[PDB]
Design an enzyme around this catalytic site. Sequence first.
Site, PDB file in Angstrom:
ATOM      1  N   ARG A   1      42.074  54.576  32.803  1.00 35.31           N
ATOM      2  CA  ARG A   1      42.156  54.677  34.244  1.00 35.31           C
ATOM      3  C   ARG A   1      43.551  55.169  34.635  1.00 35.31           C
ATOM      4  O   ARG A   1      44.556  54.734  34.034  1.00 35.31           O
ATOM      5  CB  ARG A   1      41.903  53.306  34.888  1.00 35.31           C
ATOM      6  CG  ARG A   1      42.412  53.167  36.328  1.00 35.31           C
ATOM      7  CD  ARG A   1      42.187  51.736  36.816  1.00 35.31           C
ATOM      8  NE  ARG A   1      42.881  51.460  38.066  1.00 35.31           N
ATOM      9  CZ  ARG A   1      43.004  50.242  38.591  1.00 35.31           C
ATOM     10  NH1 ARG A   1      42.470  49.189  37.968  1.00 35.31           N
ATOM     11  NH2 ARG A   1      43.678  50.067  39.729  1.00 35.31           N
TER      12      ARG A   1
ATOM     13  N   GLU B   1      41.853  51.776  47.190  1.00 39.97           N
ATOM     14  CA  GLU B   1      43.141  51.036  47.278  1.00 39.97           C
ATOM     15  C   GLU B   1      44.199  52.111  47.286  1.00 39.97           C
ATOM     16  O   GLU B   1      45.009  52.184  48.190  1.00 39.97           O
ATOM     17  CB  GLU B   1      43.311  50.075  46.086  1.00 39.97           C
ATOM     18  CG  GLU B   1      44.674  49.375  46.009  1.00 39.97           C
ATOM     19  CD  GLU B   1      44.769  48.389  44.840  1.00 39.97           C
ATOM     20  OE1 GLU B   1      43.993  47.396  44.789  1.00 39.97           O
ATOM     21  OE2 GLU B   1      45.651  48.602  43.985  1.00 39.97           O
TER      22      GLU B   1
ATOM     23  N   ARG C   1      41.530  56.833  42.440  1.00 39.88           N
ATOM     24  CA  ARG C   1      41.485  56.117  41.188  1.00 39.88           C
ATOM     25  C   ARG C   1      40.559  56.950  40.311  1.00 39.88           C
ATOM     26  O   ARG C   1      39.450  57.304  40.749  1.00 39.88           O
ATOM     27  CB  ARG C   1      40.922  54.701  41.384  1.00 39.88           C
ATOM     28  CG  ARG C   1      41.006  53.856  40.105  1.00 39.88           C
ATOM     29  CD  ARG C   1      40.153  52.581  40.167  1.00 39.88           C
ATOM     30  NE  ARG C   1      40.728  51.531  40.990  1.00 39.88           N
ATOM     31  CZ  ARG C   1      40.444  50.233  40.865  1.00 39.88           C
ATOM     32  NH1 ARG C   1      39.626  49.790  39.920  1.00 39.88           N
ATOM     33  NH2 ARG C   1      41.002  49.380  41.689  1.00 39.88           N
TER      34      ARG C   1
ATOM     35  N   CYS D   1      49.734  49.705  45.268  1.00 41.19           N
ATOM     36  CA  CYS D   1      50.274  48.535  44.565  1.00 41.19           C
ATOM     37  C   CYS D   1      51.322  48.964  43.524  1.00 41.19           C
ATOM     38  O   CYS D   1      51.040  49.764  42.637  1.00 41.19           O
ATOM     39  CB  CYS D   1      49.168  47.734  43.862  1.00 41.19           C
ATOM     40  SG  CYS D   1      49.806  46.199  43.107  1.00 41.19           S
TER      41      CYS D   1
ATOM     42  N   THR E   1      52.134  47.638  40.870  1.00 42.98           N
ATOM     43  CA  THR E   1      51.729  47.396  39.481  1.00 42.98           C
ATOM     44  C   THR E   1      51.175  48.695  38.867  1.00 42.98           C
ATOM     45  O   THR E   1      50.977  48.762  37.653  1.00 42.98           O
ATOM     46  CB  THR E   1      50.650  46.303  39.373  1.00 42.98           C
ATOM     47  OG1 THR E   1      49.500  46.741  40.088  1.00 42.98           O
ATOM     48  CG2 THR E   1      51.161  44.974  39.972  1.00 42.98           C
TER      49      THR E   1
ATOM     50  N   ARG F   1      46.077  52.668  32.780  1.00 41.98           N
ATOM     51  CA  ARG F   1      45.476  51.392  32.391  1.00 41.98           C
ATOM     52  C   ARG F   1      44.395  51.735  31.398  1.00 41.98           C
ATOM     53  O   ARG F   1      43.306  52.125  31.790  1.00 41.98           O
ATOM     54  CB  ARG F   1      44.898  50.627  33.589  1.00 41.98           C
ATOM     55  CG  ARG F   1      45.924  50.152  34.642  1.00 41.98           C
ATOM     56  CD  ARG F   1      45.212  49.425  35.788  1.00 41.98           C
ATOM     57  NE  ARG F   1      46.141  48.794  36.717  1.00 41.98           N
ATOM     58  CZ  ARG F   1      46.364  47.487  36.797  1.00 41.98           C
ATOM     59  NH1 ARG F   1      45.716  46.649  35.999  1.00 41.98           N
ATOM     60  NH2 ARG F   1      47.234  47.018  37.687  1.00 41.98           N
TER      61      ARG F   1
ATOM     62  N   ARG G   1      43.170  40.574  24.664  1.00 44.51           N
ATOM     63  CA  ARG G   1      42.466  39.576  25.477  1.00 44.51           C
ATOM     64  C   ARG G   1      41.040  39.403  24.995  1.00 44.51           C
ATOM     65  O   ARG G   1      40.382  40.364  24.599  1.00 44.51           O
ATOM     66  CB  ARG G   1      42.471  39.936  26.968  1.00 44.51           C
ATOM     67  CG  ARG G   1      43.845  39.891  27.618  1.00 44.51           C
ATOM     68  CD  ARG G   1      44.464  38.498  27.625  1.00 44.51           C
ATOM     69  NE  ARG G   1      45.919  38.555  27.802  1.00 44.51           N
ATOM     70  CZ  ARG G   1      46.681  37.524  28.162  1.00 44.51           C
ATOM     71  NH1 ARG G   1      46.141  36.334  28.397  1.00 44.51           N
ATOM     72  NH2 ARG G   1      47.991  37.681  28.290  1.00 44.51           N
TER      73      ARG G   1
ATOM     74  N   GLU H   1      27.937  34.779  25.683  1.00 43.47           N
ATOM     75  CA  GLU H   1      27.394  34.014  24.574  1.00 43.47           C
ATOM     76  C   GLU H   1      26.699  34.961  23.601  1.00 43.47           C
ATOM     77  O   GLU H   1      26.566  36.168  23.863  1.00 43.47           O
ATOM     78  CB  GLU H   1      26.428  32.935  25.076  1.00 43.47           C
ATOM     79  CG  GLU H   1      27.101  31.803  25.827  1.00 43.47           C
ATOM     80  CD  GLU H   1      26.100  30.784  26.344  1.00 43.47           C
ATOM     81  OE1 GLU H   1      25.290  31.143  27.230  1.00 43.47           O
ATOM     82  OE2 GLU H   1      26.112  29.629  25.858  1.00 43.47           O
TER      83      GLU H   1
END
Length: 359
Positions: free
Chosen positions: A130, A229, A233, A275, A277, A284, A311, A316
Amino acid sequence: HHHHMVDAAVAEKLEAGFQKLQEATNCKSLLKKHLTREIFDKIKDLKTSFGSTLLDVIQSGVENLDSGFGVYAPDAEAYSVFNDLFEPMICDYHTGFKPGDAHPPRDFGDLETFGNLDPEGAFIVSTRVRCGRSLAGYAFNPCLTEANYKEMEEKVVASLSSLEGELKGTYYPLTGMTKEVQTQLIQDRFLFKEGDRFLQAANACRYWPTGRGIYHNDAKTFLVWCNEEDHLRIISMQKGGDLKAVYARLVNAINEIEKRIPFSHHDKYGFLTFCPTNLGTTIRASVHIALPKLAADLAKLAAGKFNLQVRGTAGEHTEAEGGVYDISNKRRMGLTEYQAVKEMYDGLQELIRMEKEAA
């Protein structure tokens, strides 16, 4: 608008916001950490040429104390005018970037040095990169006029509509979006809607949904959001591990768009975004990879030597393969696009080598 003088209404609201920050001795935000009284007192009466004040910067982090970062840039000039706050915040958040650094100029680098990643399909579940862009000349959300939103969308649509080949696809405005299209985009995980409380509190949803829309290619491996935003993007993604293809598609797309639309940029901070960030390369990158043998040891966090973050993923047995990790780039600023993506590529190659070697 002059560089100084905010009206009395703004001043009163800023002081109340600063006090709320202060009394919330529980608050973990970067805004609360870095907006010291000294800084607040220095910049509280400043405005950008668009007329944005400090309230247009901090109001979201004030109203939402659970914000992680807690500021947005109401226009590109806020980064300079309110730099006394932006700078420490940006430099706290962004690994490897410090005050005085100049983010290097854009360089997507040599695509031929990527490629052979997991052609077997033994390891990597999915690959995504991204990026974000603001259009040069336009304010950011809190400051955009209704006509700005319409004009920007017309320009963005003209450019996306001209895309050929691998990028050819369809634009779907949010204005008048049908139930049927909404459902289809929800199934694809491509739909955005009016922003959460963080964006609402930032005034980032004015004139919703004028000038907002979603573009994807036919293959559904390239997605653009217009005015969600950031102005743009831009995402390339697919099943499997062909990082070369994913990255090449995005590079081709961004080059084609820029041919028609210049981007906002800053000599120190790279591509400017709503933003902070998302500054610098704005990259990203995220690869979902199955590493069940390394999952035992969690000396996996090996990834660190390539400046990559690890991460776990949810689910399940009935939903998802086990031992699958989300691997992403820790570095967005202070390195080129090529370095950021090559770090992912190099680190993933090592991870897979480690997985093959583990007992």
